[PDB]
A paper describes a structure:
[name] collagenases [name] and [name] are segmental enzymes that are thought to be activated by Ca2+-triggered domain reorientation to cause extensive tissue destruction. The collagenases consist of a [name] module (s1), a variable number of polycystic kidney disease-like (PKD-like) domains (s2a and s2b in [name] and s2 in [name]) and a variable number of collagen-binding domains (s3 in [name] and s3a and s3b in [name]). The X-ray crystal structures of Ca2+-bound holo s2a (space group C2), Ca2+-free apo s2a (space group P61), Ca2+-bound holo s2b (space group P21) and two new forms of N-terminally truncated wild-type apo s2 (space groups P21 and P212121) are reported for the first time. Comparison of crystal structures of [name] s2 with crystal structures of [name] s2a and s2b suggests that despite common tertiary folds, PKD-like domains can be grouped into two subsets.
Despite being solved in two crystal forms, the crystal structures of forms I and II of apo s2 from [name] are similar. Each asymmetric unit contains two noncrystallographic twofold symmetry-related molecules. All four molecules are virtually identical to each other (r.m.s.d. of <0.5 Å). Each structure begins at residue 685, although the first two residues (Gly-Ser) are remnants from GST-tag cleavage. The last residue is either 770 or 771. In apo s2, intermolecular antiparallel β-sheet interactions involving β-strand A could suppress dynamics of the region. Conversely, the PKD-like domain of collagenases consisting of multiple CBDs, such as s2, appears to have no surface aromatic residues. In contrast, the subset containing s2 is likely to be different; the lack of surface aromatic residues on s2 suggests that the domain is less directly involved in interactions with collagen. In this context, the spring-like dynamics of s2 may allow it to swell the fibril.
Residue numbers in the entry: 685 to 770
Amino acid sequence: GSAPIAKVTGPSTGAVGRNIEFSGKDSKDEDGKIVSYDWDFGDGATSRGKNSVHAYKKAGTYNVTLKVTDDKGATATESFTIEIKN
């Protein structure tokens, strides 16, 4: 369709205080070209950029979202759940 497709690549698990890498590299668009990647790590924190990194302060289950926007201004968001342990 006209929306881009957002995809979040990352690990299913991680540890408190460790940098976790997330990537939007497999996002794609039939009807435009993606220009921006906005991340929400589920603990209040955000980042920008195709490849982003976050460390969680506490153990828990977090829903990471990625919103991609394309050159025509069309958006899509996708979610990824990560379990963080001590």
